[PDB]
Amino acid sequence: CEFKLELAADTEKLLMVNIVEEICRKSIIRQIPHIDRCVHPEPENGKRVLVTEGVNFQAMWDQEAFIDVDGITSNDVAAVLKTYGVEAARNTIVNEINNVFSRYAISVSFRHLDLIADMMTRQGTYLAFNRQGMETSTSSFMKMSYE
Amino acid sequence: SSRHGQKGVCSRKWPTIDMPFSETGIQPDIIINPHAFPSRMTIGMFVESLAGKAGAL
Amino acid sequence: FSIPDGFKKCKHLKNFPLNGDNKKKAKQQQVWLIKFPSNVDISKLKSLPVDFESSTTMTIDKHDYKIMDDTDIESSLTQDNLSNMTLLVPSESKESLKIASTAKDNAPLQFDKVFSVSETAKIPAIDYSKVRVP
Amino acid sequence: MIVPVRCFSCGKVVGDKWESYLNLLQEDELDEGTALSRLGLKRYCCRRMILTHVDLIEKFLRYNPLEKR
Amino acid sequence: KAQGRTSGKVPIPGVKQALEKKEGLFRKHMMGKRVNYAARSVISPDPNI
Amino acid sequence: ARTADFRTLERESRFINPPKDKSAFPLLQEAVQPHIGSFNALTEGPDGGLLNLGVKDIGEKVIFDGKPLNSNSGYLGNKLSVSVEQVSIAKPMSNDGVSSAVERKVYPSESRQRLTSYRGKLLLKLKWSVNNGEENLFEVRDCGGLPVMLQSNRCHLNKMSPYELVQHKEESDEIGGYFIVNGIEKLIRMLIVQRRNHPMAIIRPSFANRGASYSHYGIQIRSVRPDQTSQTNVLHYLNDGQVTFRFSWRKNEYLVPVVMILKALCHTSDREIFDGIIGNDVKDSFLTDRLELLLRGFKKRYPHLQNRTQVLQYLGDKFRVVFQASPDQSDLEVGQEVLDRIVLVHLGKDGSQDKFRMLLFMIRKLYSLVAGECSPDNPDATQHQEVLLGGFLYGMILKEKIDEYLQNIIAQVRMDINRGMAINFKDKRYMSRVLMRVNENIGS
Amino acid sequence: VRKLLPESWGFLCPVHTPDGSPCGLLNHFAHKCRISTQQSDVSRIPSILYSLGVAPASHTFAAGPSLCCVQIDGKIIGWVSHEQGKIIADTLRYWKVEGKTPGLPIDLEIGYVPPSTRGQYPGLYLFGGHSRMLRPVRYLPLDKEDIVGPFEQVYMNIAVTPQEIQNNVHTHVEFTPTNILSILANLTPFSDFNQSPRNMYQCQMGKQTMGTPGVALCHRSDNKLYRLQTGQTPIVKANLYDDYGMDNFPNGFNAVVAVISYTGYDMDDAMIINKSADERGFGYGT
Amino acid sequence: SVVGSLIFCLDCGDLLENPNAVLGSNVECSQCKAIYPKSQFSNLKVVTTTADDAFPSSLRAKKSV
Amino acid sequence: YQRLRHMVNDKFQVRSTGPVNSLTMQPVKGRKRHGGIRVGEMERDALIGHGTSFLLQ
Amino acid sequence: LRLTAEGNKWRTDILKTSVDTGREAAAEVTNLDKDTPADDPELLKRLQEILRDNNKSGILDAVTSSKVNAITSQVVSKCVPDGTMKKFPCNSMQAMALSGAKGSNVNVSQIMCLLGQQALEGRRVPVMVSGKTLPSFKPYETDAMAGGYVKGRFYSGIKPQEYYFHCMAGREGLIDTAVKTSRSGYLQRCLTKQLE
Amino acid sequence: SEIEIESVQDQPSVAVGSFFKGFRAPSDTTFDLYKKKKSEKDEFVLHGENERLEYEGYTDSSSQASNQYVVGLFNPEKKSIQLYKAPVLVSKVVSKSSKNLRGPKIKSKSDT
Amino acid sequence: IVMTASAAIKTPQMTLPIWNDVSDEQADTFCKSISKVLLSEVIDKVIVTETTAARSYVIHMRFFDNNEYSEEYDVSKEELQNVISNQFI
RNA sequence: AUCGAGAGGA
DNA sequence: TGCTCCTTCTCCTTCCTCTCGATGGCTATGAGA
DNA sequence: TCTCATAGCCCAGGAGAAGGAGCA
Ligand SMILES: [Zn+2]
Ligand SMILES: [Zn+2]
Secondary structure (H helix, E strand, C coil), X not given: CEEXXXXXXXXXXXXXXXXXXXXXXXXXXXXXXXXEEECCCCCCCCCCEEEEEECCCHXXXXXXXXXXXXXXXXXXXXXXXXXXXXXXXXXXXXXXXXXHHHHCCCCCCHHHHHHHHHHCCCCCCCCCCCHHHHHHCCCHHHHHCXX | CCCCCCCCEEEEEECHXXXXXXXXXXXXXXXXXXXXXXXXXXXXXXXXXXXXXXXXX | CCCCCCCEECCCCCCCCCCCCCCCCCCCCEEEEEEECXXXXXXXXXXXXXXXXXXXXXXXCCCEEEEEEECCCCCCCCCCCCCCEECEECCCCXXXXXXXXXXXXXXXXXXXXXXXXXXXXXXCCCCHHHHCCC | CCCCCCCCCCCCCCHHHHHHHHHHHCCCCCCHHHHHHHHCCCCHHHHHXXXXXXXXXXXXXXXXXXXXX | CCCCCCCCCCCCCCCCCCCCCCXXXXXXXXXXXXXXXXXXXXXXXXXXX | CCCCCCCXXXXXXXXXXXXXXXXXXXXXXXXXXHHHHHHHCCCCCCCCXXXXXXXXCCCCEEECCCCCCCCCCCCCCCCEEEEEEEEEECCCEECCCCCCCCCEECCCHHHHCCCCCCEEEEEEEEEEEECCCCCCEEEEEXXXXXXXXXXXXXXXXXXXXXXXXXXXXXXXXCCCCCEEECCEEECCCCEEEECCCCCEEEECHHHHXXXXXXXXXXXXXXXXXXXXXXXXXXXXXXCCCCEEEEEXXXXXXXXXXXXXXXXXXXXXXXXXXXXXXXXXXXXXXHHHHHHHHHHHHHHHHCCCCCCCHHHHHHHHHHCCCCCCCCCCCCXXXXXXXXXXXXXXXXXXXXXXXXXXXXXXXXXXXXXXXXXXCCCCCXXXXXXXXXXXXXXXXXHHHHHHHHHHHHHHHHHHHHHHHCCXXXXXXXXXXXXXXXHHHCCCCCCC | CCCCCHHHECCECCCCCCCCCCXXXXXXXXXXXXXXXXXXXXXXXXXXXXHCCCEECCCCCCCXXXXXXXXXXXXXXXXXXXXXXXHHHHHHHHHHHCCCCCCCCCCXXXXXXXXXXXXXXXXXXXXXXXXXXXXXXXXXXCCEEEEECCCCCCCCCECCCHHHCCCCCCCEECCCHHHHXXXXXXXXXXXXXXXXXXXXXXXHHHHHECCCCCCCCCCCCCCCCCCECCCECCCCCCHHHHHCCCCCCCCCCCCCCCECCCCCCCCCCEEEEEHHHHHCCCCCEC | CEECCEECCCCCCCCECCCCCCCCCCCEECCCCCXXXXXXXXXXXXXXXXXXXXXXXXXXXXXXX | CCCECCCCCCXXXXXXXXXXXXXXXXXXXXXXXXXXXXXXXXXXXXXXXXCCHHHHC | CCEXXXXXXXXXXXXXXXXXHHHHHHHHHHCCCCCCCCCCHHHHHHHHHHHHCHHXXXXXXXXXXXXXHHHHHHHHHHHCCCCECCCCCCCHHHHHCCCCXXXXXXXXXXXXXXXXXXXXXXXXCCCCXXXXXXXXXXXXXXXXXXXXXXXXXCCCCCCHHHHHHHHHXXXXXXXXXXXXXXXXXXXXXXXHHCCC | CCCECCEEECCCCCCEEECCCCCCCCCCCCEEEEECECCCCECCEEEEECCCEEEEEECCCCXXXXXXXXXXXXXXXXXXXXXXXXXXXXXXXXXXXXXCCCCCCCCCCCCC | CCCCCCCCCCCXXXXXXXXXXXXXXXXXXXXXXXXXXXXXXXXXXXXXXXXCCCCEEEEEEEECCHHHHHHHHCCCHHHHHHHHHHHHC
């Protein structure tokens, strides 16, 4: 495919191939938004699933004729917080920390992660433990002695 | 410490009458922990001990 | 111009014989550019076996010298006026030089076979059996 | 350091042989194990007392502040 | 946050900087306190007690 | 035919009778080879030491009194020049300080059992010129007690016998190497820096951290002088078409477009720049358009610069009030001095062709790194590192302190002239009073 | 930067390195590591390079990866091809090891950077300046001693033992492979039988041993000093103990050791001493 | 001569004013005052491509047979 | 073997009632200064985890 | 810590299979014809192409690691409980390191048979710029031991190159146990201040 | 494949210069040649002018005693060569417009 | 997870269960359906030829074969036409 | 005794 | 008239022991020989 | 009457804020 452009003499030189390469890495043909790519995983004590890097839900709600839309799991919290309310992000937190400690085969009781996930939700949404999460709590000296 | 990295702390100076005695007549100077050898993998201490007994004879 | 007193005045320049063999670009002249080391004697040789064009070795006084050809920038038929160095030939002894030309052109000229003489020493082979002792 | 008095583990007094041990090396011009056998140290726990020793204490006797150099 | 007579760069401690870090006050003298009637040693095994 | 020996008899014979000719264990004295070599290279060498080579680099100091004499603006007068012709260090010689008796030898046991330093006196040859050598003086000024290195060219235990090394209250293998100050042995630890005079092509985030249009592609080079001083020179590739240049000076840096440096080294044409950078690679239109950007942007941004002299006086105007030669020097010589002191200081004079070649080569390798036809590099490997020794840095710091003290002398003269004191610098007691007021305590 | 890189084979000690905070940084050299403190007289090097058939850079007007750039330690000389470049590199090493030309020192670092896809920019570099880390190896076509620096180490073959020298695989070999260790690393017996963090712990515990500081201890006024009375030579010792003169400074002493769990005290690095050994001078400290 | 979109003087080699930005029949030099060419030059043009680096794809890895 | 320069006679320190740093009336830092040893915040977490608040006060 | 002559016979015989392991693994990942020596110029160019890319190098080193660990676990499960010079309630080393006293059977395998591969951050040893791992290797050798497959053991003596790569593994381990001391404690303090 | 050596001229006959590619030097300018005797070779010195510019140059002292070039003239039917010793004149051009400069200051004081 | 509470995950992922009637070829067809496709994935060569009529330049793009990205990314050449038409230029 | 700098240990 | 996305600044963090140092300079007064 | 010789003092690591540069 060959085409032609015309310009005036304002710049009179610029790096044209570099401009075209900067553009061609940002031109999408079929971008399902906020989804990069799916692969073919293997089931480990479960049915057949598909791992998709990139997170979205409306386009996957759309594809119900192919995909079981009732066991959609992920790793991010904020998309689960916007989509499936407040408790599903809590279950995702518990499942992700369970995954991490299963990667080292170090058993941790679920009551402690239960307590962490319910402590991170005591003000409605997904609360941090940095200065921003301590900021909402109403203890003066506890905020003082940290940062 | 020895010459194989296996440092240590003298916990008790053991009396010579309480020492294990050999058939030749002698008793050792330092008794060392035998369980330190699998984890640390210091097999050269065997070699230094054997060569030193050879040089001592 | 009084440029410094360490400089003196040249006075002799013998003329360059262009038209001893020159005709209209068909005489197959071999006018060369030669890159010699300044270590050897010049006017006591008798021949110059540089016609092999790749392996024209000439060992001079117990040391090897490979005379390679240059199809590079001094003799390439790729770029116009690719000859950096310009053949400056005189008209008489004291007078200034002028640029030599293949015809009525006022343009530089390249040279027909350009060389490069590298000092090749022996660097002998390894005694294999002496060094692989068990 | 001077050669010690007894053995480290045994207690068989062994430094008394020392210079005579040196007399077996300097004057007698003998091998090491032969001279150690002629001294009669049949246990090797004294053979590590004599052979391993170095007379550094002579080197401390060239910096005498009482002696006029 | 001030100006400065530069090229030596020696800030003498304002009362803000004496309150902010481990070298401040809440960790150096409020929480981390060197105590009285304490001891410190190297240890040794004893399978008889 | 045994494998290993004790050598008890040879050990005892070497203990009781140390050798009176040569030190025992000649392999031991390769361990402290770098410190003692880097301290002995200060005084002797292929040119007679390198510190005296180094003091012939700082040039001269020029001051003017103000001189209302009878126009005294362009003919002000009293061109006082302060410079140094020669610096050498004496071996340690001490005495009773009163009446200056003949000084006996100094041994390191005299500093061990005094809990103080071990110092030899520092002396310099101060050239005191007045108005282009019209009144030339050669004042000798002692500096004070400078520490030396043990068993080196300025300590007496260097080549004495091991027998006397026992007799002079030292170990039989007292190799030393350390310095002694305040009764404490301390030395200067070696360092690892970038290998000198080698154009290193790197990519780092801190290059782009400086500002906009700053690519990661950079040639770092560490230009040294023959006194083992150095100067960092950084070449950034831009996203514009220019190539920027970093160089440090007195805890400050600058940014210079590189074609200013190119036409400041030598008057030339742009075809020479083309022939130097890309060569026979003319089909590669990438770097061709980069050089086209460079030349058109240079001769479009400032077309009023058309030789070397205009650009050098432009540099001398732009760089007048920081190099501190402002009340006297013409801007042409100021620019030539800065190009002598910043760009490619491994040549000095008669370097302009080779400096020009080196700069075009660094531009070629920089744009080659942009196009990705060479791998990135790393200062972590031993391929591109070098060792900074103790004595070389010691001589550098002493050069620095001497130059600082001469500048402090010039500052004292500038403070004195504005009061209305003695105008003429020929006077001996005036100069003696000025040197009395100044502090020359270099040893402390 | 803390990680060990494989270009340090011969120059820095892979074993002798502290732990804790300076771990990975604070390296140590080998006993065959000379730090050159001299400008070697390499002024005749460009002249013999022009003898070797190199056109001058003034008369060249070229710069590119196809043309090998011939430099001396920060100063461009000329432009050649790469085949003749490596011929000149190895022939110049041949003229380095053999004393044929008097204006050429033994310690000229000849780095031939070959044309390789995604490597460093090519060229033949010659280093003859100060502060160059130098080390000797054995050179095979003349079978002598060869000074090699690290910038030419990657692009050239350095073997380990003579019996595995293979056909056109190496041009260099070590005198002894134990040259790759430091001074204190060689004083650990049978280092190649141990897990290397224990060798690092050994080469760091060796620098804290209360032993022999000297024999001039009646003339010094040191702040704190430590003397061990009883000093002994190890029977199990390396040859560098005899060579580099640790004989003047006995650090410790030999002992008879039964590897046994007899006491019940020796668990997790403990060790037990006979009491009469203590009572008869088991390293009395001062 | 002209090299791509780059041309200089045949004597001094200085950079010149753009022939597609002049009004006269020639090109005046920035330092000397000479006329080269007579404006009947072969027109200013280049031919440039990509570098086979900036375009990643698994399809590109399919070409690695 | 070889004897390390670390010993037990140096590294032990103890205190009953020593010098107090009268800037804050807090026990001073230093072994030769007769200084006590330091509690960390992680050790405060360890004492809250047992709940032993009387010993914590 | 000794075997019988048949134990060392098995050790040498199965380590004779480690000659072309990296060769055939590189032939696998390169996707060319198998049974090709370590000097093929198209193979060496493609190995340079693999080496200059990071993830391609990771794939090659994962395949090499899988094959050499297959050989390793083969030798371990063959020789280590079976062909000892003295059996289990006389072999005090196995009597220690089986009941959970010190370490595992991995240490017994590294003493008695071979160390294996020194996995610096889960892969093969890093390379110099010219396609050489050590100065004693010709460029792009297809030996697994050139990638660090330590065939030697802590009893019969290890090669110097094996010792050098083991020093790399030890320095990596010391860096890893130094970096994780002041790391997790900050997170622990940050989520003790919240939950007190 | 052998080529005979006929005549080796010892006197300076042809010396080769070098300016740049595309340089042709019309008839207005001349190639002024000066001598220097350092007692082993001759640094030929090139000078020249035209209506607006001026070129000067020489042969460098680090190369001409380490290099030598030969002008060759061969005839195959004669099978003969003339061989001239030749240094290469390296010379650069400046302009007559390059005689412009600023004064040694810009009249600054402590207020400036 | 617990301290920072960040939304910019390093590798955010999603695990979608599939039904039992869907075969592996059908699920991989869905995987080629869901996937994000960049333009430079189907670009072999970009050739820019400037000529200065004022300053201008002609762009020639050599793509790959149509069946390749048709089978791999489910893209026709007229979808390529429309995406050059809409967003690229 | 404050700040730097250095060293060393679990 | 009012309401968003693109640039800067502006923020913050394992335990112990020991040693060793730690402002320059511009003016007074004040005898010595 | 100057020369000393001193007193008395002047390169992570993103997350927020916060406000300009365009848009219904
Ligand atoms: Zn005994
Ligand atoms: Zn012109």
